[PDB]
Amino acid sequence: MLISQRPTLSEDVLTDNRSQFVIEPLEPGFGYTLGNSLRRTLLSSIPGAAVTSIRIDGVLHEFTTVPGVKEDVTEIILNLKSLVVSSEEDEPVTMYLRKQGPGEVTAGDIVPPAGVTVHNPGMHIATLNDKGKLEVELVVERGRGYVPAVQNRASGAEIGRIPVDSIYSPVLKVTYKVDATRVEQRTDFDKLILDVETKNSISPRDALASAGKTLVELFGLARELNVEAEGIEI
Template identity: 55%
Template sequence: GFGHTLGNSLRRTLLSSIPGAAITQVNFDDAIHEFDVIEGVYEDVTDILLNLKDVVVRLDSDEPAVLRLDAQGPGEVTAGQFSQTADVEVLSGDLVIATLSQNGRIGMEVTIEKGRGYLSAEGNKVSTAVGQIPVDSIFSPVRRVSFEVEPTRVEQSTDFDRLTLEIETDGSMSPREALASAGGTLRNLIQLVEEMSEEPQSLELTEVVTGTAGSPDLELGIEDLELSERPNNCLKRAQIHTIGELILKSEADLLSITNFGQKSLDEIIEKLDERGHQLALKD
């Protein structure tokens, strides 16, 4: 009966350690920092950066790639308008990045890189060049994982588990591919234990994530939980802005927030569970 052991291990690995690609930097023709406003564009640069964070891409090269976008108003600017290369495919072509007025114009170049988990804009800040703006990057292609364990019978034995996994990805990788990658990562880690020796062993982390393994999304805003309006607004009023800040709170802490009820609490518990997190235990 190792269903729960295997299910938890696979879920955490799927949420934290599957490689993917994302936009890490952007250079605007007419803006030099995130608080700028581009004439003829309804969104400010901060809003455009938030939209760029949601662009789903597939990168077939280990080297960074640069895509160019030029658009003239009026109308919406979508991710599908990026100039694509042989190594890069934009999968969320209908995603709206900005809206232009009659005489509006926008031009930008974005850098796309491979990575794992989540990296904040501060972590992507590798250059102090004027006009190069780092972006929060969600590299993981896995959006949600849940599993169910049921008792099952094999011939005369009744102490076996049936493990059912439900995996949702962003389309840049299939659930089957993500599961295979997670299995490979766990296999390499277990192999270190199997070959245990007195000498320290190292593992080349081409298969295993470094740094924030198990919790790459703690710096993500609570908006990424896709909560309904009431719990989302209640958390913001309580100055809880990231997933990391949220999991430091207990159920009692949340229920003490004005207008925050059991229904909102149940929703948050479910959303955190999908990402492999839980609220703090009461002191």
């Protein structure tokens, strides 16, 4: 009906991968109407690339230790789930990692197939003595949000294939708070604070813009029921 005071969006950049955003002032109650939907949208609605399953040559039935490697199996899994990757293929793509002799195995040693990018090459993966070698295959896909491991279990799954939890979401952590701002006589107005931390694939800005886009479409589904319908315009 009416036209409120136009709320503004502002950004304070905490680090390269972290930022705070404030939307303010909001008509009282709207901070919570935007808040959880914006957080869950930032988390679950942005597509990204992640490791799904891995093959490690030399481990088949019992997954405990890899001969010639200091890290055990599940720690290699932890180091791999933290690998930051982008993919244009939209279909699952396998990448390979092999290293021999003494030294440190890092994400930089991965040979990317055409159309994928490892953004954290210096990330420590494993460490090898002279007798050991690490031959490991990775199946990277695209998706949204965070899918657990059991959902990555193939019904025809190969022997030795280890499914992992996949973090597709380029944003790592999002929290939100609703404070009170004062507009003239009203001290109960809503101010929305979003603390959002992403990977180095995306900036917080572009993540917020993407979530806003897909939200505008989503509620556009409702707007389109009647385009004559009158609502708050500001």
